[PDB]
Design a protein around this ligand. Structure first.
Ligand SMILES: Nc1ncnc2c1ncn2[C@@H]1O[C@H](CSCC[C@H](N)C(=O)O)[C@@H](O)[C@H]1O
Ligand SMILES: Nc1ncnc2c1ncn2[C@@H]1O[C@H](CSCC[C@H](N)C(=O)O)[C@@H](O)[C@H]1O
Lengths: 231, 229
């Protein structure tokens, strides 16, 4: 094995030695745990990973595709510099109502932009925009305008988000892709669900794309670091 | 429960879907194999991508061995980027240079043999650049990125030196922070284990940094020196 075998005990050690979690963030995880799609949200470890990556990258304009109850957006929003901003794309009013509850609790709303609706559409309108739509005014628009992407939406559509992400990203920009291992089902060809297929196709596109570099990190359910190359 | 359980076939899948390894790098791994102390190609590419993302131009590597990570750093670096390697062994760094030279990377690479504790302190205290760091960097707050992969028992001692040498916003990448899981088991009180444990505690309690402890390889900590406001 290339990677350490994790145990419960070792995961608790990791938590106790890396995770410094605000009570409001913990509050959100507990609230989300009540919901059926509770496991749809990231670990606080993954949160911290996104946090450090945002800082390391120097990102000032982020787009999150798939927001849910808002944990990751909370991590991005607090990691951004005071002049840094994030656009969140989600189909759900209900869940992003929970997200905003926590954005407000943490005083981060000023940094955060929300566009409800289909993300394929939200991204295309942003690409084609000549001036900024009201919801992206003072954020960004047009191709090569984004520093960092977080992809965590509907999995079957991952290969369709990819070209749009790549067009919106500045050269040197970063795509962070969630769920790239899909509980290990990606490696098992008996699994042919639309979500599993989308993720496999996405991983394949990224791997064979000479315009990017990839690091597939076995954190959480797999996290791909996909950097758009210069020129 | 927090992270996916990896299998060897899932690791094979990860390899096939991320690793694009130059023949030279593969050859070095095979060679090193004849003599475990070195990284996977997966960790190499992780270090590669972090180098580009961070925009680092001055890297110090503490612990070089046969040189696989240094090769990843040196090729990831821009044309004007540079790496200083610190190692105790002429013998292993001789293998490192063989591969530096094969890849035409020597111009970007600096080397100081000896106790890295002494190398780092000398670099901090230098009024002008020492011969081995001329046209690299010297003094406090002069370094963008560190890879820490040397003698584990001295991890707590490297830490304050790294922090002094790092620019604000600079990155420390620390290898072996999980140490085969031993860090979580208090029956294990080996000097190496004690050093890594203490290092982890120091990092976690230090408000001058942020940390992400990534369960790749034998544990990799990303430790970023915070900006000074
Ligand atoms: N086509 C689509 N466009 C935009 N959002 C979508 C979408 N399909 C599903 N989603 C949303 O994407 C979310 C995926 S779960 C995202 C997890 C979240 N980033 C967290 O940290 O908790 C769900 O809330 C779902 O409503
Ligand atoms: N006190 C010390 N100062 C600097 N290097 C040391 C040291 N003690 C041991 N080392 C060296 O640290 C090296 C790195 S261990 C090998 C890992 C290497 N970075 C790689 O990618 O392959 C070994 O060669 C060992 O000789």
């Amino acid at each position: 094995r290339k990677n350490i075998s994790l145990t419960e005990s070792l995961e608790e050690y990791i938590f106790r030695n890396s995770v410094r979690e605000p009570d409001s963030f913990l509050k959100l995880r507990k609230e989300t745990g009540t919901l059926a799609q509770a496991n749809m949200q990231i670990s606080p470890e993954e949160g911290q990973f996104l946090n450090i990556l945002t800082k390391i990258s120097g990102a000032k304009r982020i787009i999150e595709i798939g927001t849910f109850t808002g944990y990751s957006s909370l991590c991005f929003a607090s990691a951004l510099p005071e002049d840094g901003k994030i656009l969140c794309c989600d189909v759900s009013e209900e869940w992003t109502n929970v997200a905003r509850k926590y954005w407000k609790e943490n005083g981060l709303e000023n940094k955060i932009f929300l566009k409800l609706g289909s993300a394929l559409e939200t991204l295309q309108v942003l690409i084609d925009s000549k001036s900024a739509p009201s919801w992206a005014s003072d954020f960004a628009f047009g191709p090569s305008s984004i520093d960092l992407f977080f992809l965590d939406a509907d999995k079957e559509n991952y290969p369709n988000y990819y070209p749009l992400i790549l067009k919106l990203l500045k050269p040197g920009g970063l795509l962070i892709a969630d769920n790239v291992l899909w509980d290990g089902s990606v490696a098992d060809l008996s699994h042919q669900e639309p979500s599993t297929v989308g993720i496999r196709k996405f991983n394949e596109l990224v791997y064979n794309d000479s315009l990017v570099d990839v690091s597939l990190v076995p954190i959480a359910d797999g996290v791909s670091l996909v950097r758009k190359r210069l020129e």
